C-alpha positions as YAML, in Angstrom:
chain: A
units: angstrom
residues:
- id: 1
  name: UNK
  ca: [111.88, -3.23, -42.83]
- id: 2
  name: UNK
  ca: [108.89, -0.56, -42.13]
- id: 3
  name: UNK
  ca: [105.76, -0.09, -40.57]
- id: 4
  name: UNK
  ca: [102.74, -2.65, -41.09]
- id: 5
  name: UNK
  ca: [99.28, -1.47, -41.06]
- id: 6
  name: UNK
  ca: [96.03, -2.96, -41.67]
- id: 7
  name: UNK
  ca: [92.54, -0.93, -41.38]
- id: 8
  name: UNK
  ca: [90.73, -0.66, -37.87]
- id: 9
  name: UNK
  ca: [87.41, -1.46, -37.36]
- id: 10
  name: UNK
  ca: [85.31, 0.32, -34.58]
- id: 11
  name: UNK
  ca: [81.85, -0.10, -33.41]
- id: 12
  name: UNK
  ca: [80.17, 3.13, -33.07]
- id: 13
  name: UNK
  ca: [78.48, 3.72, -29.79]
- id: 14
  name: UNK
  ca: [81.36, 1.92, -27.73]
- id: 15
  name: UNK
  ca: [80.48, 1.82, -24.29]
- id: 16
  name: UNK
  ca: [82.91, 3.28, -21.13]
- id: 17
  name: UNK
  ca: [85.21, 2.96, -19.64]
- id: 18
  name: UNK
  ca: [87.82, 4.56, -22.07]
- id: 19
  name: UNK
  ca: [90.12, 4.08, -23.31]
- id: 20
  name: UNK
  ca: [89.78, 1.12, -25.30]
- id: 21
  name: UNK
  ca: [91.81, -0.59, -27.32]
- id: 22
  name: UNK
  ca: [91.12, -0.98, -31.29]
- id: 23
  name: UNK
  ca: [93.87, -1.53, -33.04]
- id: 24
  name: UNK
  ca: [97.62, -2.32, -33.30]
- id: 25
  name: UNK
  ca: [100.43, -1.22, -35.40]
- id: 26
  name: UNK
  ca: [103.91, -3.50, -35.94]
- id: 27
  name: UNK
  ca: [107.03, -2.15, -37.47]
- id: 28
  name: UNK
  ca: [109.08, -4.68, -39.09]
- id: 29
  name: UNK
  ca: [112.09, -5.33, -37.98]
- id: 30
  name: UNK
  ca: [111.77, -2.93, -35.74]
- id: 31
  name: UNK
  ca: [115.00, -0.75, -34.77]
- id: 32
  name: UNK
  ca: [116.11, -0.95, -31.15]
- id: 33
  name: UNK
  ca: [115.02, 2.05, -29.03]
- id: 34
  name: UNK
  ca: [112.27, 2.95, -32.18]
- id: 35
  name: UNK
  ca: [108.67, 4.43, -30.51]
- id: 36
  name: UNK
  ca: [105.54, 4.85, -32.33]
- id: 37
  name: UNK
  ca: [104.06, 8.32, -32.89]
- id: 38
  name: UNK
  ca: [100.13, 9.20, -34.18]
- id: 39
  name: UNK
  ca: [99.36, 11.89, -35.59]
- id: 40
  name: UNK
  ca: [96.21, 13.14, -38.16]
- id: 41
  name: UNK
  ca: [92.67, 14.62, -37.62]
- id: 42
  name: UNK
  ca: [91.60, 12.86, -34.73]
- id: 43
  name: UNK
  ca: [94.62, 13.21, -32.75]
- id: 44
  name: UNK
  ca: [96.39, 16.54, -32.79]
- id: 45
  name: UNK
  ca: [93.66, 18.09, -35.81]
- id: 46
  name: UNK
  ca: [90.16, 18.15, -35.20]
- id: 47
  name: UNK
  ca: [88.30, 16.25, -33.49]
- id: 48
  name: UNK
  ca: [91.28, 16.14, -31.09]
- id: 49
  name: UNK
  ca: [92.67, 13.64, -28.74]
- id: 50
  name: UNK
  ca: [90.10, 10.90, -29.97]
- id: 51
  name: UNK
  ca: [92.83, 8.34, -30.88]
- id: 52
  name: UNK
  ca: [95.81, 7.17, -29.12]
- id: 53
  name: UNK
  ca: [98.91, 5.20, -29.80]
- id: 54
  name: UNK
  ca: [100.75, 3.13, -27.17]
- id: 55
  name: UNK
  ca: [104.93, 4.34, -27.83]
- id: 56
  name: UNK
  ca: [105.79, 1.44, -26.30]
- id: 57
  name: UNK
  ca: [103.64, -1.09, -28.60]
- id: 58
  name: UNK
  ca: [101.60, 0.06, -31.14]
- id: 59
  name: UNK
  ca: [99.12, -0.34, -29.98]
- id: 60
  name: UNK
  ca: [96.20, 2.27, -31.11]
- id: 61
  name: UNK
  ca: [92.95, 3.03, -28.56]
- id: 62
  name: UNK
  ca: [89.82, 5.44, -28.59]
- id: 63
  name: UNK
  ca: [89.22, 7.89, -26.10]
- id: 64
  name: UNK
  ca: [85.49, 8.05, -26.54]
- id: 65
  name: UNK
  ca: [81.84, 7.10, -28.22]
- id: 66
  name: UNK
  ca: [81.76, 7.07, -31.67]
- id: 67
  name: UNK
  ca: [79.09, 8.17, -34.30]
- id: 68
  name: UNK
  ca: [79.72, 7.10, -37.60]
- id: 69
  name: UNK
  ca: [77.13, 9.74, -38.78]
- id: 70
  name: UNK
  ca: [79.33, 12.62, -37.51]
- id: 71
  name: UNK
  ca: [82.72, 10.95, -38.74]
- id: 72
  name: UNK
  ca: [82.84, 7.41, -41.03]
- id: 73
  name: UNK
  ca: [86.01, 6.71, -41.68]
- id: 74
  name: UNK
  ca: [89.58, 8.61, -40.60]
- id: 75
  name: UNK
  ca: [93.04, 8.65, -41.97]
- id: 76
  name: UNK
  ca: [95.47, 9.01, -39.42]
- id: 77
  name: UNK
  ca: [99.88, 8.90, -39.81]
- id: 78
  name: UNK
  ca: [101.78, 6.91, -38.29]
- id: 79
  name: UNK
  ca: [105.91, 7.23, -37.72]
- id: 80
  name: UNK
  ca: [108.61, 5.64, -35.85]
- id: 81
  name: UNK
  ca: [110.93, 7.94, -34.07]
- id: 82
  name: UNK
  ca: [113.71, 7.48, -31.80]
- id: 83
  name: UNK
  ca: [113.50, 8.83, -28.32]
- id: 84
  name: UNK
  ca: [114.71, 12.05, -29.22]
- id: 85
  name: UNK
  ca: [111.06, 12.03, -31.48]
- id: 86
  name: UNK
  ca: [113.24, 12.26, -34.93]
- id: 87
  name: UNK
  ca: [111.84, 10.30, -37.67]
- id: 88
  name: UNK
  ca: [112.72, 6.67, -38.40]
- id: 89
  name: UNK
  ca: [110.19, 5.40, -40.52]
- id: 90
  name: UNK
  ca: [107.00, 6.64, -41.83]
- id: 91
  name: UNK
  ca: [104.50, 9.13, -41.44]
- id: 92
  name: UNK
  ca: [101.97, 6.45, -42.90]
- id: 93
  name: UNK
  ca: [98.77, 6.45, -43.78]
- id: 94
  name: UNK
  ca: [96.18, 4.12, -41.49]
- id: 95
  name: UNK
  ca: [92.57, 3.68, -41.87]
- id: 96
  name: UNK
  ca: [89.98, 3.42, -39.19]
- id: 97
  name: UNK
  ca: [86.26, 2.84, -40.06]
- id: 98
  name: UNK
  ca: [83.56, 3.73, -37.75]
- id: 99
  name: UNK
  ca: [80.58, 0.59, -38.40]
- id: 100
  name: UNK
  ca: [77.37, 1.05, -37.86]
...
């Protein structure tokens, strides 16, 4: 029944400690042993490692300050896999906006 997005909305200049959490992803009728997996530029392309995804819950976080100067707005894939990491659902697009 697929993966359910809706756009995240962060505050630039977030203070620490990070991570924090910004977002949240649901599948729909989610399969049993399904995990979520984020991928895009921001996570494993330039600027790396700057958004996270809980496997568990879907939940998405940011690893650091934000500027939306540098970067406004990324698009970043998100998939269901099952624990052997091949695809259930997805990848799908989901939007995060950096506000100033």
């Amino acid at each position: 029944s697929g993966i359910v997005v809706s756009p995240i909305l962060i505050p630039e200049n977030q203070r620490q400690p990070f991570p924090r959490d910004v977002g949240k992803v649901v599948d729909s009728d989610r399969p049993e042993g399904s995990k979520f997996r984020l991928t895009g530029k921001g996570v494993d392309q330039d600027p790396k490692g700057t958004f996270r995804i809980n496997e568990n819950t879907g939940s998405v976080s940011v690893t650091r300050t934000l500027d939306r100067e540098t970067i406004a707005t990324y698009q970043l894939y998100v998939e269901t896999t099952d624990a052997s990491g091949k695809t259930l659902e997805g990848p799908v697009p989901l939007e995060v906006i950096v506000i100033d």
